[PDB]
Design a protein around this ligand. Structure first.
Ligand code: A99
Length: 246
């Protein structure tokens, strides 16, 4: 069994080659929050309103396939209400969903104040949803690496200050940057390599694609062609093993 076979057995595909000697140098670790430190999967964390309002909103969201709509529908079914028939349905990307039941106009869209999701009935907002991501069952062995070489650990996210801080508390590392953009991330990575730091970065979806390509060693989850490594196993722990045995 080659080095490619032994690494694959341990959940890791090595597309690169010299990546092994590169890792020895690494002094800083950066996570892109969504999809790496979480499953990247919205659920409803709270609903404010009554059951009739909840059934209307689910009925209209049942005709969409956007992951926000699927989460609302699934929450409503857990609460025991059922799906009702909708006329004149229209979906409007970037905004949300609209439709007609028992002679009332129902819209579901971003709230006028927050990132909350709001339910409008004949033009008045009568209910709302708080929607969050799902955290991977933690490895406090982050601390086992905070110990090891006392490496520097950083977290980048695009989500709002409320949401990215709470996670930064859930596990204990005191250095995160929230409210970011794909090109803001690239800027911070530059600004550190431009300080001679050797960076390993872990990423997943759309945003991180670009800063991964910018990393000394880059790692992409199992769910592009830029990553030195692929965690087909989606087991962050397995990687933490690789790091603390480098
Ligand atoms: C992917 C996900 O949500 P996201 O990343 O916000 O999806 P996005 O692509 O930015 O949405 P857009 O750009 O299509 O629509 C912009 C805004 O219009 C509203 N909006 C849009 N569609 C709808 C709808 N069907 N119903 C209600 N409101 C809607 C709504 O207020 C939406 O934010 C999610 C959520 C939580 C955790 C983790 C993940 N995750 O990444 O897996």
């Amino acid at each position: 069994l080659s080095l490619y076979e032994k690494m694959l057995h341990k959940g890791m595909i090595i597309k690169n080659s010299n990546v092994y000697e590169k890792i020895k140098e690494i002094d800083t670790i950066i996570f892109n929050k969504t999809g790496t430190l979480t499953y990247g999967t919205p659920i409803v964390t709270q609903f404010i309103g009554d059951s009739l309002s909840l059934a209307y909103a689910a009925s209209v969201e049942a005709l969409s396939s956007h992951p926000i709509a699927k989460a609302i529908v699934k929450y409503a079914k857990e609460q025991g209400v059922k799906i009702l028939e909708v006329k004149d349905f229209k979906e409007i990307s970037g905004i949300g969903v609209r439709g007609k039941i028992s002679d009332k106009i129902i819209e579901v869209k971003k709230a006028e104040n927050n990132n909350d999701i709001a339910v409008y009935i004949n033009g008045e907002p009568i209910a709302s949803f708080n929607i969050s991501d799902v955290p991977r069952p933690n490895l406090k062995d982050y601390l086992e690496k905070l110990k090891n070489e006392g490496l520097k650990i950083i977290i980048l996210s695009g989500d709002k200050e409320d949401k990215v801080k709470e996670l930064s508390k859930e596990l204990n590392i005191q250095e995160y940057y929230s409210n970011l953009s794909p090109e803001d991330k690239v800027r911070i990575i530059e600004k550190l390599k431009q300080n001679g730091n050797k960076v390993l970065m872990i990423g997943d979806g759309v945003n991180d694609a670009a800063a991964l390509a910018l990393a000394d060693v880059s790692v992409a989850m199992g769910n592009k062609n830029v990553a030195d490594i692929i965690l087909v196993s989606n087991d962050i722990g397995t990687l933490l093993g690789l790091i603390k045995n480098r």
